Design a protein around this ligand. Sequence first.
Ligand SMILES: CC(C)[C@@H](C)/C=C/[C@@H](C)[C@H]1CC[C@H]2C3=CC=C4C[C@@H](O)CC[C@]4(C)[C@H]3CC[C@]12C
Ligand SMILES: CC(C)[C@@H](C)/C=C/[C@@H](C)[C@H]1CC[C@H]2C3=CC=C4C[C@@H](O)CC[C@]4(C)[C@H]3CC[C@]12C
Ligand SMILES: CC(C)[C@@H](C)/C=C/[C@@H](C)[C@H]1CC[C@H]2C3=CC=C4C[C@@H](O)CC[C@]4(C)[C@H]3CC[C@]12C
Ligand SMILES: CC(C)[C@@H](C)/C=C/[C@@H](C)[C@H]1CC[C@H]2C3=CC=C4C[C@@H](O)CC[C@]4(C)[C@H]3CC[C@]12C
Lengths: 602, 602
Amino acid sequence: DWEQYRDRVNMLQQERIRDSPLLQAAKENDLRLLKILLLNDFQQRGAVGETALHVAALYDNLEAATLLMEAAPELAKEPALCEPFVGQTALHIAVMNQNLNLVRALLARGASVSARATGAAFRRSPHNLIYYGEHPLSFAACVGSEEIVRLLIEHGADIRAQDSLGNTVLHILILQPNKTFACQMYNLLLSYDEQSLELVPNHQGLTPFKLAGVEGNTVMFQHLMQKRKHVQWTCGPLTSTLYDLTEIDSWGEELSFLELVVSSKKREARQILEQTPVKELVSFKWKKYGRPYFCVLASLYILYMICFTTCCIYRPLKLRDDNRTDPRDITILQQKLLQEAYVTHQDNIRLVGELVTVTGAVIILLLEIPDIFRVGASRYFGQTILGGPFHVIIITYASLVLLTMVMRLTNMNGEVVPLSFALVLGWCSVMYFARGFQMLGPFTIMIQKMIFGDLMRFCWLMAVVILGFASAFHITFQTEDPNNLGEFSDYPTALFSTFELFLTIIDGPANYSVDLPFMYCITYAAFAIIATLLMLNLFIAMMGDTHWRVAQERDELWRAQVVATTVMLERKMPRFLWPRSGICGYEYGLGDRWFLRVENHH
Amino acid sequence: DWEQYRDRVNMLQQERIRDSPLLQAAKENDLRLLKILLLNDFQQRGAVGETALHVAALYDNLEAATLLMEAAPELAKEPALCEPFVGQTALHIAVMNQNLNLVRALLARGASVSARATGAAFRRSPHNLIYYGEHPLSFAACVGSEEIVRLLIEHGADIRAQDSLGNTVLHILILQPNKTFACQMYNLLLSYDEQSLELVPNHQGLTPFKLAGVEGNTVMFQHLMQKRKHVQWTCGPLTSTLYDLTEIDSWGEELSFLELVVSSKKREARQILEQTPVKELVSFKWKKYGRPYFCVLASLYILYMICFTTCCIYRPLKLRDDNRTDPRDITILQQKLLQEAYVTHQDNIRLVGELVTVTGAVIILLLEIPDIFRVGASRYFGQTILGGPFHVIIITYASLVLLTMVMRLTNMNGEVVPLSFALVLGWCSVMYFARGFQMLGPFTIMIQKMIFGDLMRFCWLMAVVILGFASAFHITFQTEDPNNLGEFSDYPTALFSTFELFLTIIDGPANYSVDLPFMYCITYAAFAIIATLLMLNLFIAMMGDTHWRVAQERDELWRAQVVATTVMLERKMPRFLWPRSGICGYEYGLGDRWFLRVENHH
Ligand SMILES: CC(C)[C@@H](C)/C=C/[C@@H](C)[C@H]1CC[C@H]2C3=CC=C4C[C@@H](O)CC[C@]4(C)[C@H]3CC[C@]12C
Ligand SMILES: CC(C)[C@@H](C)/C=C/[C@@H](C)[C@H]1CC[C@H]2C3=CC=C4C[C@@H](O)CC[C@]4(C)[C@H]3CC[C@]12C
Ligand SMILES: CC(C)[C@@H](C)/C=C/[C@@H](C)[C@H]1CC[C@H]2C3=CC=C4C[C@@H](O)CC[C@]4(C)[C@H]3CC[C@]12C
Ligand SMILES: CC(C)[C@@H](C)/C=C/[C@@H](C)[C@H]1CC[C@H]2C3=CC=C4C[C@@H](O)CC[C@]4(C)[C@H]3CC[C@]12C
């Protein structure tokens, strides 16, 4: 376990500090015994691998630290050695504690300004509570001190230093939860930059602009957009602003800014889409091109669904050759063969309809299966922003249509099974296009939240109630005639009848001409009290609570779904139908950049 | 597109400012190169059509503006020429920026005080963020400056100047969203008025009083009612106020104040009906005359509905001459002819009842069809204040009754179709009279909001669910005997049965004497989980959320419906049954005005 190993490391470090007298005197700033010991091994290390100067920097002992840098000047260069803190120097712990004079004394003794703390306690992990980087400059930028940052820069710290994750100091500053003073430190560190430091990619390929978009740092995004705007004029309450769309539109890039924002796992990333360039950019993209193309694609999919349904209704069936020996058997028709089916003109119309259906199912798999590999199977099917479960049911519908096609070509009986699954899933996949409308999109998201929410727990306890009462009903009617009351004659029939009686979609089985057992009456009274009266209306109460508790999240989810649909439509549709958004700067002498003009009222 | 043209105009204006050195020096207030250029074309124009003095007034450059009015005194008279800003002078941009000394210097050089900015960026449009008028006096009244208003008036600006929309400066002041300081500017501009400026109509025929009523400017209405009130006395906590009803009652006018207020498309116009004269005026009108007349009209309509229903029940039917050849055919009666029907005394009673029904349907079309033309088909049927959908179903009911009348006179079979539509619509039109009661009016409005709200989206996804499961059920029972389970024998029958099974108004089809396919069991279990359990109760949860989220709007909608019903009853009923409201001033020597007395407690 990671917690037990870190706990053992911490108590071992404290124990080896306690056993060593030099480490103890560096811990509680005991000057007298320090002078006695330094007058009388100075490079002894603890369990972490740290020196006594590390202990003095850890416990904020300035006098003790100056004492052992006077006695041992080389002690200000050695880092810790063992795994959880390897690379940590005394400069790192002095910078973390914001001790200005200790940092000055360490830099006077020869502390490295580019020491890399590559330990496991400094990586960006859920194990670590903080992620301040690996360099002392990143640590000083993240603790919140200006003066140690200027001191480290004037002593020769690399501003463009990258850690093991590839993050520069700008990336680590953006990854902080302060979100307000990090802009001041960003301005301070950009003052010393004058390629740019703002265009140095991450190991994930992210600029600091793209990292601020992904992590949902809205204040940092607004601060970054100040340097990319230009106020054209201000006339009274009206002002015209010219936002740069180079980093935002990301034309020609395989992974754009908006694609990374709408496919981010953070809940705060959807608030980037409501900012001052981005909201009107995606609104213009949706109003001018996204909505009509989504509407005609929805119309084409509805026509394709109508064609598939009409091919399902007119499927080839012949009269059953085998006689109905069993009285309970009611099958009078059976499937036709390959040569027996397509012999008429209506069969040729159904043939071209089925060819259109198979062509549409192949086209569906040519558009979805590449999209799993570009993003990932966890994000393509798990993110409701991109249309997660809808892609699952669409891929399943295409697979079932191809299974029915090879069933037809192989002449296997039982086409009704994949045709029924394909019909239900393909028709329920038309709700994917509901996200393009304000009337239906939030309701579809609420359906998605209720299916994976209240319905799952309700069905989980419903299985228990239905199993118990179905077993009780089946053992109650195990001694009676199944002709007079056949709801509980067989145990699967008892389970189905009890499920239907819970949902009250069938009547309570009562035959007044005969004498039912009293155990059925008592068990069904309890079933009607607990299942019908209590549980079926408690589901309505629970969904009524959960409906108003997630309505705001539902609206923001729908807005981000509209933006992600716009991004998907711009990525997949041809370029000649999706012109580049914004105003071209080459027509007006502003270089090769594209801008978006916003006129606001203050 | 209007946004792209305005964006191109703005970037072209900035580009032509950037290319020209005179426009550039007027932009960033470069005095040195300005003196060099003026010592060395001065009337050059940009893309907008503006001079360099326009640029100096736009970028608030006082010294630059004084420089080119010293060099070119005629430059302070030329307006912009091209379409989006035609008529805009430098005085307009100086007034917009609230530059007092620049306005003084322009007026010293000979700037026109009555320049009309007839461009497309100054009209009252949703394209423009502001509507400040076309004259510099309206601009100075709307930016919020007293001093430039007094300066422009003392320099000879017309206070009664009207723009292309016909609005005076009072109208444009009322159309501002400040709503508090606009009263101070209204008092300032009325101080210089002393026909009155307050009685100058709009091109829509509106006074500033009527414009404040239409736009829902409640603070401006309260400020306007201070000049039309008169405190008779004040005795302790009791004070008696005498409000003038000349502008409010609008006796003799075809388009009154209250009719314009209740038929306004703004949501804030319904708050005018709660103000200090208007609320008690419409309350006295409703309590004294509106409620009893509405009650007796509702009673007459209920009696007419009873007569029409009784004529529908006793309709002439004869025994079917053709034999029932088809076993499924159950039609045993058919319609009588014209000469065959009215042969008895009960047939004569039904004849006079049907004549009363046709007379009522003709009277209905004589009262509604004129009212569409006076207001408009979008507002008569779209505004729930006036009874929008109720007029639609009433006109449809009258049309269906006349269609049944010509069907009877033409002897066409199939009267049951328009008689069924007419019965349902005419009986559901009795809910129009529910607005006169506190118990039923808000509930009727909530029904209207739920029909066009949650029910529409629920039915839109319900069509998808029912279509998919109906197709699955029909292909499941395509091979079985239709005698033992005929719910899904035909595809329209499968669609109807699946809709009924979703709403659980029929039982789940189960025949325990025969063996149903397992695909029906799996598909119906999924149908009962998704449609019956999830969706049918999620509709209740969604309507429970939407009920409490619009309840206040429901109450205000009902109050405005009561006021609009009072206005309609006063307009349509004869004058001898609706006496003029208020206290006549001729009986007490106060001229020919009518007043309403309000006694309040402070
Ligand atoms: C007998 C078979 C056909 C079984 C497996 C039935 C499955 C259907 C009824 C279920 C399986 C997964 C379901 C499902 C998953 C997720 C969503 C997203 C939501 O926003 C709209 C509804 C929607 C689309 C629903 C509709 C109902 C579906 C499609
Ligand atoms: C608890 C949740 C997950 C819901 C969906 C479960 C419902 C159970 C009670 C339902 C769903 C599918 C049903 C079902 C499907 C098909 C058949 C085949 C039929 O010839 C005998 C009954 C039988 C075996 C029934 C029994 C009851 C089942 C198992
Ligand atoms: C088979 C036919 C008769 C079809 C078309 C039925 C239509 C009826 C049921 C529908 C059509 C329009 C509906 C309708 C529209 C608007 C309103 C306003 C609301 O505040 C009260 C209910 C009311 C009055 C409802 C009642 C139900 C009506 C009248
Ligand atoms: C989705 C919303 C808008 C609601 C109202 C739609 C409901 C559908 C499922 C209903 C409404 C009217 C129904 C309907 C009306 C009349 C007939 C004639 C009958 O001889 C065969 C069934 C048939 C054809 C059914 C089929 C199911 C329909 C089409």
